[PDB]
Amino acid sequence: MTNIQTQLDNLRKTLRQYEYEYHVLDNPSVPDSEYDRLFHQLKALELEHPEFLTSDSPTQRVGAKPLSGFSQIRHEIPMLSLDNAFSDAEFNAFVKRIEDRLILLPKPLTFCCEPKLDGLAVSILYVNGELTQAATRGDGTTGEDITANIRTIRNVPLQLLTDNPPARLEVRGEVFMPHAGFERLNKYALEHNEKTFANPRNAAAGSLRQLDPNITSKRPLVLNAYGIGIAEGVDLPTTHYARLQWLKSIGIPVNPEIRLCNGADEVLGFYRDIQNKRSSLGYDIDGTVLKINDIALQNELGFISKAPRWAIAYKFPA
């Protein structure tokens, strides 16, 4: 044991906890200045004693070197797409269909309802709690390695906040740029004669395809996690909402507008509530994602491969 190893370990733990309070809980226990005081003390100490510098320390989010290009990543589990609806009657038809298709329809049928963010879909792998790899969705099968860019995102933890992290955990979600950051970036680009962005979605996509993480780091990007891919060495909750609460409890940012709704009429109330809230959120949303909350019912329902909306195979019973 040495005093400087202990000071480093204490500063790192303290800083990860404050980043959690600030970014995930939206309830910081100390002022921004106090966080910075400790951050730059950690940074100086690590540079004065480099033998003790760690790759997942809060000070190591930004690579000092711009990349030459992006490698490809074939996802182990494919990143699927989402069906869509444009009316209450259409949503009601989707529910009526699940009601008939299920062996046993429960009373109530609970949905996990979320706002649909307007950003870039990503997959982030944590190995024994440490962020090791991140990829874009791409076509759902293969994407680009954006690990160095994802590491710059302030609300993305480099280490999971648990003493018993899973062996492997892949977090799925959306990277977006809130309104305030987007307006600041466009003002800056105008004041320093550069390319302005038409909308927050374009600003987030453009920021994530930067080969220099030093540029990505200056872009006000945020992650909201909405799912899990690989999950080894853990018993994941049996409802979708509980899995999201579990990600939030181990350091991963999740949207605070997510609710449970029993039946189609409550879900439509959520849709309407979120639709009126649109003007006050501070980031863009295209709609709402409504998911069957029970994982066993999701597994029973399964998925539909790339197919027409204009055809169906009415199969005969045995």
Add this chain to the structure above:
Amino acid sequence: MTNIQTQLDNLRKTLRQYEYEYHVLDNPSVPDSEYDRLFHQLKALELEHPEFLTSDSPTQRVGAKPLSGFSQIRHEIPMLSLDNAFSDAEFNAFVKRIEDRLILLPKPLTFCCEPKLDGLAVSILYVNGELTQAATRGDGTTGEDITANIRTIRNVPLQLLTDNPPARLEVRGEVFMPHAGFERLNKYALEHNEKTFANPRNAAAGSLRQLDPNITSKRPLVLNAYGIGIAEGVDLPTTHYARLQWLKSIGIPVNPEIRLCNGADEVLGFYRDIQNKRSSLGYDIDGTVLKINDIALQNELGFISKAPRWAIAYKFPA
């Protein structure tokens, strides 16, 4: 001009026309013996005058050499999958959803209704009327080159029956083995101590993965065409049924049980009619494929990429 070139040209035309009457129309104008008399006269003449032998002649369906292996074919247009239903209420929900999702719902909403064959999905390319390539569906993106095996199928024309074939035409359909052939094959395999097949679907799949076309040729395989892929140098009909009638009119086999039905209740009548007919068809069917007949309505509805049945994105209107 020579008398033998003219005799060859006349025999070939006559034989293709009789194969059409026999296989597509199910209305042969001559006995089987008359067809064979002309077939073996053509075959002897071609062997006596090999300079005039053509690769698409009715006598050249079977390659004399077994293949070493199967090459891969990436489809130019992906081969999609089909959504499914297991009840009237579920089918009715699928229709209710199309009714709401369409800009303008026509009165009536016409469906092209077909039996769902229980075979192997294939893609067959004709270049200026000549069969040049055939592939299995595989995963919908890449499949295997089974040209030599597809050429052995008696009801598959090596040449389209039209003087103005399209520049390129890809026919999509199912290869299956009728009951009579399946029962004969299993009796033969038992009488010559060999592998028997559990069902016609397995017998068709196993027959198409034979590297020796001489073995495939002895398997009683049939094609029923249900769609079009590539279509260059032609104005395809604007309804699905008319496209199928057009394939039938240029030499391609299509199922005779296909009908047009106006609205969900007529479609369910078709489903019931086909369900009672099951015991009398002479080949296996899993259900019925019900498709929106108007191509512009299909195009408007589009497709759903690989997605869950347990989630939906209810999008906000502009």
